[PDB]
Design a protein around this ligand. Sequence first.
Ligand SMILES: O=C(Nc1ccc(Nc2nc(Nc3ccc(O)cc3)ncc2F)cc1)c1ccccc1Cl
Ligand SMILES: O=C(Nc1ccc(Nc2nc(Nc3ccc(O)cc3)ncc2F)cc1)c1ccccc1Cl
Lengths: 250, 250
Amino acid sequence: RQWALEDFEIGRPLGKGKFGNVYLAREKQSKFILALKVLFKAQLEKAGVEHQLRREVEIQSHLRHPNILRLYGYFHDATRVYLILEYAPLGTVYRELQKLSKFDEQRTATYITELANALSYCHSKRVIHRDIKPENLLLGSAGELKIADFGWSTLDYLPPEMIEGRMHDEKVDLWSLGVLCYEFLVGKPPFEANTYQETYKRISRVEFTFPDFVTEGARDLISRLLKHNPSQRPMLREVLEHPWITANSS
Amino acid sequence: RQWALEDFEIGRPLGKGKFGNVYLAREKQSKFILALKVLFKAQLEKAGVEHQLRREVEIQSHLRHPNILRLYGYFHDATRVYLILEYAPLGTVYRELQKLSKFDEQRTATYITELANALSYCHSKRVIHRDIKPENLLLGSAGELKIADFGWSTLDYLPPEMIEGRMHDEKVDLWSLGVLCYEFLVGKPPFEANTYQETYKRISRVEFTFPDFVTEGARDLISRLLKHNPSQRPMLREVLEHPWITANSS
Ligand SMILES: O=C(Nc1ccc(Nc2nc(Nc3ccc(O)cc3)ncc2F)cc1)c1ccccc1Cl
Ligand SMILES: O=C(Nc1ccc(Nc2nc(Nc3ccc(O)cc3)ncc2F)cc1)c1ccccc1Cl
């Protein structure tokens, strides 16, 4: 059963992205609440990322996990593309982190567990993510983490393989986890800088430090994840078993 | 200065491809004879290769070499894409090879030289080719070889890196040269078979033999090119210097 814009009542804007906004919406016939992401073809085409989107939509449609935002379907009209998405009521992790400044060890451990599980499910279907940013980590009604950026296959979140033009792997997800884990605990990502040129150098040299309040256990996990060599990074299985994770996660 | 279909008089079909035909055409205002390749958007989009084409057109527009078919420009209407191409009057090498059965050493050496030069120019601009088939090797008015398949970055022409799902390189062009050189001399490519499954195995094992009429010099060149390890293949510079090439090429 195909869709069109007239099938939905559009509510307030949830976010204004670069390629278009995502709105709250309600399917008229069923009253099913959801999110509607509205993209403009001409913009996608001029940026040269329309095919990159079609692939990402193809992958997402296959993925069912409580910590991955569902793609229900999609459609288009003369000038726009529309993605019909699950609605995450509690907003972005980014906003949560701004309000709180930083997260305690149990909230962080819990989120990393949820991410590791989601990525573990993705890994078993041979799917990776370019980038996992807090702006695309959403919260379900019970506060459950939901990955909103779509799967593949500002530099802050990119691993050295990618930025240096090296050969990337399933292991980019492990770096992502280390970046997020740090950002959750200290309130900004470990390679933050005022320029791209400097953020690049820092990612490439793996040059970061920990504030004094970051405990030994978290240091150990974060350091194991943020290895320059992707092969030196652990498997997702091992992150879920790290004593700092098991001691603190739900 | 943009184009449209009304700018051209369309002549007979030069070839009927999968995604559309290429026609002889004459620009009305200038009387400039050329080839017009006509593609259907909906077909490209359904096959999922529209972006692959846009990239290939972007690369080709940059390439100027007497042995690379010129792309003059392009345009589109509601349903079609149009590529404005240089006209190669003497047709495909494939047809030439069918008429002749096989080529002598001097015609072959000459063609490989022309290909090596074209690829050498492409290599210096960091461009490769997925596949170089005789069906996409065209002939200019003086019989000069022109590469018609566009640049990147039936299995007969694909190297083992690609078919095995390995990491490919600039070195795929060297394999291509070895396949063509053989096909030119014997009149069919070295891994030909009645099935894809068998052609695959043969490419992967590098399993071919030479008819008795293929001379030592040609055996030596072809064998150096068709190495399983891409790193073991020579540089284009060395192909142009091979004694069998220099002894026989124009
Ligand atoms: O990425 C951002 N926002 C954002 C917003 C919506 C989406 N997509 C969806 N979001 C929502 N829920 C949501 C609820 C309340 C909010 O305030 C925000 C979101 N559900 C489904 C989505 F696809 C993705 C991302 C963002 C980026 C920079 C700064 C602040 C923010 Cl909130
Ligand atoms: O690929 C084939 N043909 C083909 C035809 C045209 C193009 N494109 C252009 N060709 C031509 N010239 C040409 C002249 C006479 C001919 O009989 C054929 C071509 N110039 C420009 C092209 F873009 C590319 C390829 C082919 C494929 C299988 C069997 C036989 C053939 Cl002739």
